[PDB]
Design a protein around this motif. Structure first.
Motif, short mmCIF file in Angstrom:
data_model
loop_
_atom_site.label_atom_id
_atom_site.label_comp_id
_atom_site.label_asym_id
_atom_site.label_seq_id
_atom_site.Cartn_x
_atom_site.Cartn_y
_atom_site.Cartn_z
N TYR A 103 3.72 67.44 90.15
CA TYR A 103 3.96 66.02 89.98
C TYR A 103 4.65 65.74 88.64
CZ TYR A 103 0.22 65.92 93.57
OH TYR A 103 -0.58 66.13 94.66
N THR A 104 5.05 64.49 88.46
CA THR A 104 5.63 63.94 87.24
C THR A 104 4.88 62.67 86.90
OG1 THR A 104 7.67 63.33 86.09
CG2 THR A 104 7.46 62.64 88.42
N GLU A 105 5.25 62.03 85.79
CA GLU A 105 4.67 60.74 85.42
C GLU A 105 4.99 59.63 86.43
OE1 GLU A 105 6.39 57.88 84.04
OE2 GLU A 105 4.82 56.83 82.94
N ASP A 106 6.10 59.74 87.16
CA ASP A 106 6.51 58.69 88.10
C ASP A 106 5.60 58.63 89.32
OD1 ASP A 106 8.61 58.94 86.24
OD2 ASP A 106 9.82 60.09 87.67
N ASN A 107 5.51 59.74 90.06
CA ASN A 107 4.79 59.80 91.33
C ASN A 107 3.38 60.35 91.17
OD1 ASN A 107 6.72 58.57 92.88
ND2 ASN A 107 7.18 60.36 94.15
N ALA A 108 2.79 60.20 89.98
CA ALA A 108 1.36 60.35 89.76
C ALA A 108 0.54 59.15 90.26
CB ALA A 108 1.08 60.57 88.27
N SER A 109 1.20 58.11 90.77
CA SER A 109 0.51 56.98 91.38
C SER A 109 -0.14 57.36 92.70
CB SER A 109 1.49 55.83 91.60
OG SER A 109 2.25 56.05 92.77
N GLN A 110 0.53 58.18 93.51
CA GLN A 110 -0.06 58.62 94.77
C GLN A 110 -1.09 59.71 94.59
OE1 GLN A 110 3.21 60.12 97.10
NE2 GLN A 110 3.73 61.67 95.57
N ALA A 111 -1.16 60.33 93.40
CA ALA A 111 -2.06 61.46 93.16
C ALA A 111 -3.46 61.00 92.75
CB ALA A 111 -1.45 62.37 92.10
N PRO A 167 -1.12 63.54 86.29
CA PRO A 167 -1.92 62.40 86.78
C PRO A 167 -3.23 62.20 86.06
CG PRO A 167 -1.10 63.64 88.60
CD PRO A 167 -0.92 64.49 87.41
N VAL A 168 -3.83 63.27 85.54
CA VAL A 168 -5.23 63.19 85.18
C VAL A 168 -5.43 62.48 83.84
CG1 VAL A 168 -5.49 65.49 84.03
CG2 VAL A 168 -7.35 64.50 85.42
N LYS A 169 -4.45 62.53 82.93
CA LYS A 169 -4.51 61.72 81.72
C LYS A 169 -4.17 60.27 82.01
CE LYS A 169 -3.27 65.61 78.74
NZ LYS A 169 -2.12 66.43 78.27
N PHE A 170 -3.44 60.03 83.10
CA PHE A 170 -3.04 58.70 83.53
C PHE A 170 -4.22 57.97 84.16
CE2 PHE A 170 -1.16 56.15 87.10
CZ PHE A 170 -0.54 55.17 86.32
N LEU A 171 -5.08 58.70 84.86
CA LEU A 171 -6.29 58.13 85.45
C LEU A 171 -7.41 58.12 84.42
CD1 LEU A 171 -6.54 60.18 88.85
CD2 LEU A 171 -5.48 57.96 88.69
N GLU A 172 -8.09 56.98 84.30
CA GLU A 172 -9.29 56.87 83.48
C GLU A 172 -10.14 55.76 84.10
OE1 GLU A 172 -11.04 56.38 78.95
OE2 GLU A 172 -9.38 55.15 79.69
N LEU A 189 -13.99 57.28 87.50
CA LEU A 189 -13.60 58.41 88.34
C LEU A 189 -13.66 59.72 87.54
CD1 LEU A 189 -10.40 56.83 90.04
CD2 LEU A 189 -12.81 56.37 90.56
N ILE A 190 -13.80 60.83 88.28
CA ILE A 190 -14.54 62.04 87.86
C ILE A 190 -13.91 62.79 86.66
CG2 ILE A 190 -16.01 63.84 88.99
CD1 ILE A 190 -16.31 61.32 90.42
N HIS A 191 -12.68 62.43 86.27
CA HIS A 191 -12.07 62.94 85.03
C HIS A 191 -12.88 62.57 83.78
CE1 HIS A 191 -8.84 62.48 81.77
NE2 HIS A 191 -9.12 63.76 81.85
#
Lengths: 181, 144
Positions: free
Chosen positions: A1-9, A37-42, A45-47
């Motif tokens: 993935y990239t920063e762009d399509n980390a939305s679907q991830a 994706p995982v730094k983008f998600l906070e 959720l389990i990260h």
């Protein structure tokens, strides 16, 4: 993935940890933090549990069982198998540092009694992460080696000046052994 | 015993398609690390080297103990026949037998050339382990 399509991830980003937190022998949670994706998600959720796992220790998780009984128990995970992972990662990070370490540390850090240590040290020496030993008569834990959770620029630096003289000492013998004939 | 078996030195030769196939195999393979030369524990490889040497020197001790006895056979018999020289030559003035074989000396040369095989190899074995001992002096050398 990239920063762009980390939305679907979102869904495999849940799935990859909660399949591997079912797995008691997945020991690298540093590779689950290096993802776009995982730094983008906070949030909940389990990260959020991973920063309790990787640098942090059992004092930062024994608070977390009191806050949510619901959410960690909801998806895929039972609690006492998560505990024995966190029993290890405090002790493994302790056994980096001292290597002269006494018995009473682990009754006081890992919150078990006096005779629960000696089966538990075998659990760390079997699965390949810390190869430890007991001088049980003098009440000491001498370890051979330990494994690291996250590196730093100190951590490359110990590797450098140990190896640089070790190259330099082998420079002397590569001179001296080929000069015989 | 120095010209008992002369040694001819070996030089390796190939065609270049074997060097293709050496280059072909080395890439496409599992990584077989060459570590078995620098092993730094052998005392029963050294032990049966010396124990097979000890029975032949005890075989060599057997050969020269009987070589005393062959001389103890001949030193009596030469003087006994020269006693029989002085016995029989005094006899005919007033009137007017088997010599032993030695141990057969091809086995005494065979044991020294066999002990020659122990002498070249265990002393080539000697600095072979002592080289990996002395490179291991450089391995502990920084560790405080």
């Amino acid at each position: 993935y990239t920063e762009d399509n980390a939305s679907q991830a979102r869904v495999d980003a849940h799935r990859c940890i909660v399949r591997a937190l079912k797995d008691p022998n997945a020991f690298l949670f540093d590779h689950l933090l290096t993802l776009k994706p995982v730094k983008f998600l906070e949030g909940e959720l389990i990260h959020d549990l991973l920063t309790i796992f990787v640098s942090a220790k059992l004092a930062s998780y024994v608070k977390f069982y009191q806050n949510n009984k619901d959410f960690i128990d909801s998806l895929g995970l039972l609690h006492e198998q998560n505990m024995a992972k966190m029993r290890l990662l405090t002790f493994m990070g302790m056994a980096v540092e001292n290597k002269e370490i006494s018995f009473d540390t682990m009754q006081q850090e890992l919150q078990i009694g006096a005779d629960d240590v000696e089966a538990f040290v075998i659990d760390a020496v079997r699965t390949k992460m810390v190869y430890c030993k007991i001088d049980q008569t003098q009440r000491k834990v001498v370890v051979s080696h330990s494994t690291h959770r996250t590196f730093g620029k100190q951590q490359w630096q110990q590797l450098y000046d140990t190896l640089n003289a070790w190259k330099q000492n082998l420079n002397k013998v590569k001179n001296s052994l080929l000069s015989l004939s | 015993f120095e010209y008992m078996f002369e040694e001819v030195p070996i030089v390796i030769k190939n065609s270049h398609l074997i060097n293709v196939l050496m280059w072909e195999l080395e890439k496409k393979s599992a990584v077989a690390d060459k570590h078995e030369l620098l092993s730094l524990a052998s005392s029963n490889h050294l032990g049966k080297n010396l124990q097979l040497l000890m029975d032949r020197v005890d075989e060599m001790s057997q050969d020269i103990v009987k070589y005393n006895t062959y001389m103890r056979n001949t030193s009596k018999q030469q003087q006994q026949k020269h006693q029989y020289q002085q016995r029989r030559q005094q006899e005919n003035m007033q009137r007017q037998f088997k010599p032993p074989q030695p141990p057969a000396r091809m086995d005494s040369l065979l044991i020294a050339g066999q002990i020659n095989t122990y002498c070249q190899n265990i002393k080539e074995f000697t600095a072979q382990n002592l080289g990996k001992l002395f490179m291991a002096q450089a391995l502990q050398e920084y560790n405080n």
